[PDB]
Structure 1
Amino acid sequence: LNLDSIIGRLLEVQGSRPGKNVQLTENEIRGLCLKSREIFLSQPILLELEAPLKICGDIKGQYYDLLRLFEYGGFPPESNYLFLGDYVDRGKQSLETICLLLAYKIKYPENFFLLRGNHECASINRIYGFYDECKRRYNIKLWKTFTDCFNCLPIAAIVDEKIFCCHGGLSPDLQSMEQIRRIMRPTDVPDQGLLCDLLWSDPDKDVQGWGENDRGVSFTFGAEVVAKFLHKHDLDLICRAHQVVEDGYEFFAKRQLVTLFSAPNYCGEFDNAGAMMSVDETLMCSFQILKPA
């Protein structure tokens, strides 16, 4: 597997025509899936990470925005990275997006980290774009290969014992961090339970405790649930993604939670920015932002 050749071809389109494709070979992409899947399984499902690092929210197949984020924050391994999921679907270039991320995971497995989002799930990506992209540009066998890889992604991360990171949010079934560690892989995303909530749930300002989620699955949770959770586990901040926020980042519950959304120009009702959160050596948080066009 020629990682450097794969990465070079993926980076070559920097500054190129609007949405120029990078078409790797089917064998190259299969290698990316198999080697990265092996690495994911060898590392904990609940990652224990160290700052400084940069944390990104949703990319949703916006490959050229992923390149801008690496341009702004430093291409790996110049900075450590944690991504919070939702790499595929919706966008025009999910394949380039997930392939560059998997290539970086294989090249720098101790300095580059990818969490699972709710779109790293076959039943979701059958509807929202990644399936059609794989079928159009490769074949469905490769799409199954991606799904086998997605099923081994880690689900959460804790940065220096203080910042809890996941794609969706909290769970009414999440009482101990060991519950996350006991989850076996490979696994699909269930329509209910701890793993589902970690990838699907949302914080809500107008809910007290746990409420119904407009997405039709999982729950919403209020500011007090966040406060109680941070106290019980001696944490300072919840870092999640999953929800489009206009500024690319939005704090919640008196800065006890932050939402990161890294795909700009995504929403149809408002022009959103994309934000990447820089966490320095002492866990101080700043932002690098893709302003809307």
Structure 2
Amino acid sequence: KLNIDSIIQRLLEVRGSKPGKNVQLQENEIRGLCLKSREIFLSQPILLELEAPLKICGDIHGQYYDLLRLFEYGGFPPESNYLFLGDYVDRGKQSLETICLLLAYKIKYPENFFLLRGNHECASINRIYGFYDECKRRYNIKLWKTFTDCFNCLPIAAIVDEKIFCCHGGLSPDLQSMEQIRRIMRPTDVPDQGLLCDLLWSDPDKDVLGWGENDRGVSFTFGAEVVAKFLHKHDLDLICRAHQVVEDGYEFFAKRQLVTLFSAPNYCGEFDNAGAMMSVDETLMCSFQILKPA
């Protein structure tokens, strides 16, 4: 029943327009995106094992016209393969269009386009930071619930070519084995502590070395020694995460053993930050494309 091509065409029709212009899909169409993407998310592993070549993006937060920007720099699907690290909704003004385009591409190109869960893909959080209000304002609360059901099935982490470990937040002191991630059962809401919480909420910290307390009031911080041991233990070369704004769009930590990516330029209209996108080529060489704020 679902006309994906037409949905994608209408979402892209506003390319070039000044930021703010809405796209108005029918409720039934959005509901269809959620239900069909949810089938796909559940049919694929919770810990994705992906291969290069690949583009990797961090937080978007409903900045739809920045998402379009990313695709014009990186290549509209299927010209490149994509992995997004979560935080698609909240704070920005066009979360619906952001998430709709992402889900549409996921349905169209399920083997070449991937979405991880971020900490905002949780109903207790996106109720407060804007997605609930955007849904209510534009459609209704029932549609917001349909999105939650779909968010609850997103995968949590990826390993790219057995060398790059990717997740929204970062590491967990509870993470002894990758099998622990593969055993996480979907759908689920994100608990307030534990492994799943930490993957979506933790942060690197330059002033600690081991594990520390996190100023967010949830989860932990980790230092360079945690990072080194994790990579040595699992025979990995790099951790790739998002979750924090970085002035330059990306930022290395711990002698380039971790990188933070952030893909929303001029975040909230408040910050003066650039957005970045990481390319991994077949040789596992990492490059960056930078989108300066306009």
- Per the TM alignment, residue 267 of structure 1 is displaced from its structure 2 partner at its CA by 5.7
- Per the TM alignment, residue 244 of structure 1 is displaced from its structure 2 partner at its CA by 0.4
- Per the TM alignment, residue 248 of structure 1 is displaced from its structure 2 partner at its CA by 0.4
Question: 1:65-214 alignment to 2 at 5 Å?
Answer: 65-214=66-215
- Per the TM alignment, residue 292 of structure 1 is displaced from its structure 2 partner at its CA by 1.8
How far apart in 1 are the matches of 2:19 and 2:87?
A: 22
SS in 2 for 1:228: helix
Are 2:153 and 2:186, in contact at CA under 8 Å, matched by a contact in 1? yes
- Per the TM alignment, residue 19 of structure 1 is displaced from its structure 2 partner at its CA by 1.3
- Per the TM alignment, residue 270 of structure 1 is displaced from its structure 2 partner at its CA by 4.0
- Per the TM alignment, residue 17 of structure 1 is displaced from its structure 2 partner at its CA by 3.2
How far apart in 2 are the matches of 1:225 and 1:131?
A: 37
Deviations 1:41-67 (A, max 9, x none): 000000000000000000000000000
- Per the TM alignment, residue 142 of structure 1 is displaced from its structure 2 partner at its CA by 0.3
How far apart in 2 are the matches of 1:155 and 1:195?
A: 8
Are 2:96 and 2:134, in contact at CA under 8 Å, matched by a contact in 1? yes
Structure 1: state its 5+ residue gaps.
none
Are 1:274 and 1:291, in contact at CA under 8 Å, matched by a contact in 2? yes
Are 1:244 and 1:267, in contact at CA under 8 Å, matched by a contact in 2? no
C-alpha change, 1:269 and 1:2, in structure 2 (3 Å) is closer
Deviations 1:169-205 (A, max 9, x none): 0000001000000000000011100000000000000
Identity between Structure 1 and Structure 2 (%): 98
Are 2:46 and 2:181, in contact at CA under 8 Å, matched by a contact in 1? yes
- Per the TM alignment, residue 16 of structure 1 is displaced from its structure 2 partner at its CA by 1.4
Structure 2: state its 5+ residue gaps.
none
Greater CA deviation, 54-63 or 264-273?
264-273
C-alpha change, 1:13 and 1:257, in structure 2 (3 Å) is same
Deviations 1:12-38 (A, max 9, x none): 000113311011100000000000000
- Per the TM alignment, residue 73 of structure 1 is displaced from its structure 2 partner at its CA by 0.4
- Per the TM alignment, residue 268 of structure 1 is displaced from its structure 2 partner at its CA by 6.8
How far apart in 2 are the matches of 1:136 and 1:144?
A: 14
Are 2:92 and 2:268, in contact at CA under 8 Å, matched by a contact in 1? no
Deviations 1:137-157 (A, max 9, x none): 000000000000000000000
C-alpha change, 1:219 and 1:102, in structure 2 (3 Å) is same
SS in 2 for 1:127: coil
C-alpha change, 1:195 and 1:232, in structure 2 (3 Å) is same
Question: 1:11 and 2:12 equivalent?
Answer: yes
Are 1:171 and 1:197, in contact at CA under 8 Å, matched by a contact in 2? yes
Are 2:45 and 2:182, in contact at CA under 8 Å, matched by a contact in 1? yes
How far apart in 2 are the matches of 1:24 and 1:59?
A: 20
Deviations 1:213-237 (A, max 9, x none): 1111000000000000000000000
Segments of 4+ moved more than 6 angstroms: none
- Per the TM alignment, residue 283 of structure 1 is displaced from its structure 2 partner at its CA by 1.1
Deviations 1:59-108 (A, max 9, x none): 00000000000000000010000000000000010000000000000000
SS in 2 for 1:128: coil
Are 1:9 and 1:22, in contact at CA under 8 Å, matched by a contact in 2? yes
Q: TM-score, normalised by structure 1?
A: 0.99
How far apart in 2 are the matches of 1:40 and 1:25?
A: 23
Are 1:166 and 1:239, in contact at CA under 8 Å, matched by a contact in 2? yes
SS in 1 for 2:268: coil
How far apart in 2 are the matches of 1:163 and 1:265?
A: 27
SS in 2 for 1:287: strand
Are 1:167 and 1:198, in contact at CA under 8 Å, matched by a contact in 2? yes
Q: TM-score, normalised by structure 2?
A: 0.98
- Per the TM alignment, residue 208 of structure 1 is displaced from its structure 2 partner at its CA by 2.2
Q: RMSD of aligned C-alpha atoms?
A: 0.8
How far apart in 2 are the matches of 1:63 and 1:269?
A: 17
